[PDB]
Amino acid sequence: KVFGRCELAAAMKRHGLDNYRGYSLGNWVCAAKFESNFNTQATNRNTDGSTDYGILQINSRWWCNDGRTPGSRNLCNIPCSALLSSDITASVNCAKKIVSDGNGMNAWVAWRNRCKGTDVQAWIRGCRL
Ligand SMILES: [Cl-]
Ligand SMILES: [Cl-]
Ligand SMILES: [Cl-]
Ligand SMILES: [Cl-]
Ligand code: NA
Ligand code: NA
């Protein structure tokens, strides 16, 4: 599924991401834009052989099992393919674990490099939330 900007913001708010650990909703929308262009089906290989999945590009080295990432962990206890669903519940719940892991949203390098220090509220401007 390819979400609209405000449709995704509403879904993320309904699932409790708005100000989770201090990160206002625009941070999560900005991260999703640059990680996946709001596409739940997005996949991308990393140089180490792991793969990133779904709207927030969650990686199989630590967070999910894809059966093909040797020496990895599965800390969200989910198959990576669940992160590609049109229902973003698994991606949101796993993201809550990641953002709580000590480094906040710096865990998403696209957030650090493209969203951090910018006017992230712009990403939710005009949306009925
Ligand atoms: Cl957009
Ligand atoms: Cl914030
Ligand atoms: Cl959903
Ligand atoms: Cl933090
Ligand atoms: Na915001
Ligand atoms: Na894994």
Curated annotation (Swiss-Prot):
Subcellular location: Secreted
GO CC term (a single one): cytoplasm
KW Secreted (keyword) present: yes
Catalytic activity: Hydrolysis of (1->4)-beta-linkages between N-acetylmuramic acid and N-acetyl-D-glucosamine residues in a peptidoglycan and between N-acetyl-D-glucosamine residues in chitodextrins
Family annotation (SMART domains): LYZ1 (SM00263)
Every C-type lysozyme domain range: 1-129
Active-site residue list: E35, D52
The keyword Secreted is annotated on this UniProt entry: yes
SS bonds (residue pairs): C6-C127, C30-C115, C64-C80, C76-C94
Positions annotated to bind substrate: D101
Tissues with expression: In the egg white and polymorphonuclear leukocytes.
Pfam families per UniProt: Lys (PF00062)
GO MF, any single term: beta-N-acetylglucosaminidase activity
InterPro entries in the record: Glyco_hydro_22 (IPR001916), Glyco_hydro_22_CS (IPR019799), Glyco_hydro_22_lys (IPR000974), Lysozyme-like_dom_sf (IPR023346)
Keyword list, A-Z: Allergen, Antimicrobial, Bacteriolytic enzyme, Disulfide bond, Glycosidase, Hydrolase, Secreted, Signal
Known EC number: 3.2.1.17
Single GO BP term: cell wall macromolecule catabolic process
UniProt function note: Lysozymes have primarily a bacteriolytic function; those in tissues and body fluids are associated with the monocyte-macrophage system and enhance the activity of immunoagents. Has bacteriolytic activity against M.luteus.
Note: Lysozyme C is capable of both hydrolysis and transglycosylation; it also shows a slight esterase activity. It acts rapidly on both peptide-substituted and unsubstituted peptidoglycan, and slowly on chitin oligosaccharides.
Self-association and partners: Monomer.
Family: Belongs to the glycosyl hydrolase 22 family.
Protein name: Lysozyme C
Lineage, top ranks: Eukaryota, Metazoa, Chordata, Craniata, Vertebrata
